[PDB]
Amino acid sequence: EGLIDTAVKTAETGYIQRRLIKSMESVMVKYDATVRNSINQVVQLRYGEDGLAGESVEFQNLATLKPSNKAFEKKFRFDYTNERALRRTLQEDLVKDVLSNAHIQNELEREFERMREDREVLRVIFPTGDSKVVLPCNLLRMIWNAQKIFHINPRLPSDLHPIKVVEGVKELSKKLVIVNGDDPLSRQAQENATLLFNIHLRSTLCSRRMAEEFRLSGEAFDWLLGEIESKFNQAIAHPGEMVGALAA
């Protein structure tokens, strides 16, 4: 029985694969960053609904997904009121700043509102609560490499102001582009394409997390941002790739 099954499988899968390849042997990514067939008919505005190659993608987890409201609040809020904990994490030249300056407090409140919004988006997007998702850069491994390189020593108070992390993440999101163009439609498409990745990036690099679990320094965080942007640009799909034959 096993031998007969193997023979029929080898006889049918051959014709199946032949048809699958002849159906899409012409599809390819054009220089306009869009998948089209031989008739220039758009099949995907962006390859894989993202515009990224399937080689530089690894499995990761969405930290802000399936949390308990209270757990999420206490973990992604960065309390700027517990002066004892603020001294324990940051340095004295930053605790007084985060206490006095109210602009920083408003910025962190706005960041938490944006974090809550992204969590709701993930919940309405990924029903059933599935944290395992494929994304380009493995931010956890990158943070680990940065720690092991710069010798962070998670124990001493780090020197990284939350405003610095917030502005760095914002600048990094502005840099990573897929749909080049200041047009309203261009910006809308760019945001919709890199939505999940930016959500995951923000969820990983958070003020409270970066100040509690990672303890990265300024130079370490700068190197982390550089590495992330470089890896994302490298994972960008190369125009002129027979995505059709690859999928077949």
């Binding site: 517990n82 004892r84 904990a85 324990r88 092991k148 010798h151 020593n153 998670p154 124990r155």
Partner: protein, 149 residues
């Protein structure tokens, strides 16, 4: 000096969960002064040990008395003094974890240093006072000699 730690320990239990390998076993030892737990993995073959045995364990950052901080490389052709001359079992590892009971307000009061001697693991749990010379990512030595008492 470089003596990151030095203390006498006594053996009280070996491989409580059954001996897994054939040349290595767990040494659940307890201090005598500092009151500290020790979960060391030694080579039972070349350096056999039984229950009730006491050994003077000295975790150091270098084997030289003057303390020159060696770069870290196998150089047997060395006539310099060595602290290993009065120890029977020496191993070179790198502390890979330092857990502690920290909180969000008051500092930690109890630490636990996990070091790996190229395969053999040793956990040294105790107070957060005598474990100041232990830092993550750092080479250390074991240096243990059995006491005749």
């Amino acid at each position: 000096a470089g003596i990151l730690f030095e203390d006498i320990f006594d053996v009280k239990d070996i491989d409580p969960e059954g001996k897994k390998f054939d040349r290595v076993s767990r040494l659940h030892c307890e201090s005598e002064s500092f009151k500290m737990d020790l979960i060391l993995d030694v080579n039972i073959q070349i350096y056999p040990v039984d229950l009730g045995d006491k050994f003077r364990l000295v975790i150091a950052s270098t084997l030289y008395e003057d303390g020159t901080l060696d770069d870290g490389e196998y150089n047997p052709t060395d006539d310099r003094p060595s602290r290993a001359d009065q120890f029977e079992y020496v191993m070179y590892g790198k502390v890979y974890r330092i857990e502690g009971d920290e909180t969000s307000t008051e500092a930690a009061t109890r630490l636990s240093a996990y070091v790996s001697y190229g395969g053999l693991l040793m956990r040294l749990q105790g107070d957060a006072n005598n474990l100041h010379g232990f830092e993550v990512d750092s080479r250390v030595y074991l240096l243990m000699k059995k006491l005749a008492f």
